[PDB]
Write a protein that binds this ligand. Sequence first.
Ligand SMILES: [Mn+2]
Length: 272
Amino acid sequence: GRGSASLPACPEESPLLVGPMLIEFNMPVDLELVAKQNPNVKMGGRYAPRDCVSPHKVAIIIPFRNRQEHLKYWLYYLHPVLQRQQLDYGIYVINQAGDTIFNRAKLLNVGFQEALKDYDYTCFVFSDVDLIPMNDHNAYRCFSQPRHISVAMDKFGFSLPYVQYFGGVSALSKQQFLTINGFPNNYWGWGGEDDDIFNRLVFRGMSISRPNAVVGTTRHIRHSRNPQRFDRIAHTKETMLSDGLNSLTYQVLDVQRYPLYTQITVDIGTPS
Ligand SMILES: [Mn+2]
């Protein structure tokens, strides 16, 4: 019964998952130690199973600016999880250059476009750097519909702010992201960019996929520095096709590949 054969696809659900995890942010993290503890993660924070092929080719995009301690906790907790989930993944920290108002959604668009230059990713997880999953059955990859991953956040009492809430951590396949023309580029701290994204999905006929709440619990990291739904539905319809990936403009000032992640420093301009 011999002959040349391809590696099998990885199983529908990984047999390596452990379920609940204790998430704490009160101890120091040393990334050199984390790298040594995750020897299979390659330069730039890249990993893929050795014994099976994953259909999940995921770029994990993290909007960022001056929050190194949070990022260290993020890397410490997620790398082991992402490997147990048997994903073919890469970590991208999109660092906003300058001191102008932070623009989360625009940095996510940057991450989508830059990660694609590195590899043919077909799934994108957009994650704030201060959100950590409490259960590894919460899959960091894409589904038949846009996926909302951080569904029961401790900062919100482990309950969804509202059924249309799409903030924190989410995942869109390449097809899903492209069809909504990505995310809006003009929410300069205005708040509600996630609601605009939700409106884009609905308008294109998509719905929200969510893991069961029991495994969707996430912890939020506090920093020395419940949400309500913003409207702008009519604005989204009017603006989505002219404001997003197609109109995205930015300058890449630095690209650093570290053992556990790639950091792309970009100048995304100032509010126009
Ligand atoms: Mn926060």
